């Protein structure tokens, strides 16, 4: 039961720019995803103040970074608010439209790709290092879904029958062949310390079994 959707033309152009532009400072993708995780965790924490049952799906508010050399994936997991099917398919891409236009304008005026987060479209920076991105998400008001895209103007959404998450979002980065440094413990620690040292949630960098 896999549905295929076209990105809005502005998002497809943003993704092509990220993939095509020569830009060496790719490490910023991690700061952007951790920032998105922190925002989602802030959202559930805020909502839980007026409705404590919103934490019945899990009280722990944290971020896990999980590298896997065998699958060549780097996963960023949070126990934030999560996304409904409507968030995944339409609402978040609608918001992203204006941010995309402002960003592309800022770039033509002298800005650089690392400033993507100032335009609210930081998730797409995942395409600096990933040939494919899989997003597993679970919001309190909906079922678990798997979103996926290798760019090229489309994405898919399916209900996810994999390991249940409770609540939150898991961004799985299927890394490009030449971007395996992002699976290295020393490299991830360096990036987190440089760009994400003040995030208000524990960040656990998992290590590899082999």
Binding track over 57-86 against ligand B2K, x by CB under 6 A: ---------------------x-xxxx---
Provide φ and ψ at 123, rounded to 5°: -50, -40
Q: Which of 10, 11, 14, 36 binds ligand B2K (CB under 6 A)?
A: 36
Provide the minimum distance between the beta carbon of 110 and ligand B2K in the complex, in angstroms, as a whole number: 26
97 annotated binding-site participant: yes
Provide the minimum distance between the beta carbon of 92 and ligand B2K in the complex, in angstroms, as a whole number: 4
Is 117 a binding residue for ligand B2K by CB under 6 A? The answer is no
Q: State the Cα–Cα distance between residues 137 and 145, nearest whole angstrom.
A: 6
Pick between residue 81 and residue 151 the one whose CB is nearest to ligand B2K: 81
Contacts of 109 (CB under 8 A, 6+ apart): none
Interface region with ligand B2K, contact rule CB under 6 A, candidates 35-43, 100-108, 158-166, 200-208: 35-43
Q: Which structure tokens are listed for 95? A: 């918001």
155 annotated binding-site participant: no
Residue list for the binding site for ATP: 36, 78, 97, 123
Question: Which residues bind to ligand B2K, rule: CB under 6 A?
Answer: 36-37, 40, 78, 80-83, 88, 92, 123, 135, 147, 169
């Amino acid at each position: 039961e896999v549905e295929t959707f076209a990105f809005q033309a502005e998002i497809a152009q943003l993704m092509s720019l990220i993939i095509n532009t020569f830009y060496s400072n790719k490490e910023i993708f991690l700061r952007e995803l951790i920032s998105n995780s922190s925002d989602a965790l802030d959202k559930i924490r805020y909502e839980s103040l007026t409705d404590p049952s919103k934490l019945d799906s899990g009280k722990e508010l944290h971020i896990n970074l999980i590298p896997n050399k065998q699958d060549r994936t780097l996963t960023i997991v949070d126990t934030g608010i999560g996304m409904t099917k409507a968030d995944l398919i339409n609402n978040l891409g609608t918001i992203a439209k204006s941010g995309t236009k402002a960003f592309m304008e800022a770039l033509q005026a002298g800005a650089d790709i690392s400033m993507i987060g100032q335009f609210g479209v930081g998730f797409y920076s995942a395409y600096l290092v990933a040939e494919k991105v899989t997003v597993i998400t679970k919001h309190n008001d909906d079922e678990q879904y798997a979103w996926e895209s290798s760019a090229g103007g489309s994405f898919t959404v399916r209900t996810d029958t994999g390991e249940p998450m409770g609540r939150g979002t898991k961004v799985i980065l299927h890394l490009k062949e030449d971007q395996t440094e992002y699976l290295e413990e020393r490299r991830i620690k360096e990036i987190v310390k440089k760009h994400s040292q003040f995030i208000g949630y524990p960040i656990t960098l998992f290590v590899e079994k082999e």
